[PDB]
Amino acid sequence: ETLNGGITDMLTELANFEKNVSQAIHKYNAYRKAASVIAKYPHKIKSGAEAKKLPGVGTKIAEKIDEFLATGKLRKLEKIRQDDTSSSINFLTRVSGIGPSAARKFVDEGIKTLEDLRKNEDKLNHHQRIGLKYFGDFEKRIPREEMLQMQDIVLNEVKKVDSEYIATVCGSFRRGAESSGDMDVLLTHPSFTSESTKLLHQVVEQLQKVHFITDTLSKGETKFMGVCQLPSKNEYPHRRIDIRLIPKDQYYCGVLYFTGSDIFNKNMRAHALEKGFTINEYTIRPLGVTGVAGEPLPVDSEKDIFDYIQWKYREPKDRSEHHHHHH
DNA sequence: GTCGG
DNA sequence: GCTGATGCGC
DNA sequence: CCGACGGCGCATCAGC
Ligand SMILES: Nc1nc(=O)n([C@@H]2CS[C@H](COP(=O)(O)OP(=O)(O)OP(=O)(O)O)O2)cc1F
Ligand SMILES: [Mn+2]
Ligand SMILES: [Mn+2]
Ligand SMILES: [Mn+2]
Ligand SMILES: [Mn+2]
Ligand SMILES: [Mn+2]
Ligand SMILES: [Mn+2]
Ligand code: NA
Ligand code: NA
Ligand code: NA
Ligand code: NA
Known about the structure:
Helix content is 48%, strand content 12%. By secondary structure, the protein is α+β, with helices and mostly antiparallel strands. It has 4 domains: 1-83, DNA polymerase, domain 1 (Orthogonal Bundle); 84-140, DNA polymerase, domain 1; 141-257, Beta Polymerase, domain 2 (2-Layer Sandwich); 258-320, DNA polymerase, thumb domain (Beta Polymerase, domain 3, 2-Layer Sandwich), CATH 3.30.210.10. Strand 8 and strand 9 (284-286) form a beta hairpin. It is globular and about 60 Å long. The protein binds 3 DNA strands through helix 2, helix 4, helix 7, strand 5 and helix 15. The active site is at residue 64.
């Protein structure tokens, strides 16, 4: 199935360990980068040397690849898997609301299992209460077929609140994925621009009023994080939904951001820094001589952003990650 | 952990 | 109130 | 203790 899959899984496992157990956020990103680059490499890897040529594979990862190529495993990962404290910390971070820091506190207080975690609800904040409540459903992927029915509801209900709203389903759906992990809804309204001043609320209560949104993780004036569910013919899993209100006049920088992937975005924002610019979901600005962002540059399309940084435009579908296959 | 300066 | 970290997530 | 690594919304606490 997956060309070099053994290696990329290995590197993914290490990344997760550095993040969740070591709290080494930059080592985590080194391994992710490594995993991404190898996955998109179109040849089989014969050695750590070969791999090392790829940007973001260095000495220590080559070594590991050698070890893995030679033995079909990695001793560093055997020791880690066996370490039950590492394994429970890792596990707890898969609940939404719990990161490396809380997962560690919980495990050092004898909370190690799903069963233990439910026993100690009173220890959890609201966000964690809800991620635990839907832990199972949130592990499932969303078929594009079901994404369409959700778009239909979201779009219809936005129009019914105020037809001047425009709602756009971004994330992995806009990239054409046949399944998505969540639903990312990007929202504009002409009253909200970068120079103006309860636009997101209305939409959320409307979506709750017709019982599509079922819970709330967090909510502010511009970003809503919650749970949703299709009505049953006769039940559908609950699902994560992200609703983002961005300023009407910065739609392109915002839709670029909200389309992802995550890895595409940090690579893009990294390539810009070396060219001399800084990008966020609102603007692309030139970095001053002192690394200080200057005034925003004009953007009339997604391609204008790529253009400023001397990148070839890439349609949404080519902003996903890929892997390659062996026979 | 990698890169680069 | 304000600012500024830290934790968490996308 | 070579240093930067993407960038920021929401929740919370700390120090003023
Ligand atoms: N680290 C991240 N940086 C980003 O810019 N993003 C952006 C913000 S919103 C857009 C989509 O994020 P999601 O986490 O919903 O990821 P996705 O839709 O690509 O993937 P999925 O199908 O939701 O698993 O990507 C996400 C990150 F995780
Ligand atoms: Mn495949
Ligand atoms: Mn294989
Ligand atoms: Mn490739
Ligand atoms: Mn205890
Ligand atoms: Mn998504
Ligand atoms: Mn999302
Ligand atoms: Na390299
Ligand atoms: Na988590
Ligand atoms: Na308790
Ligand atoms: Na459920």
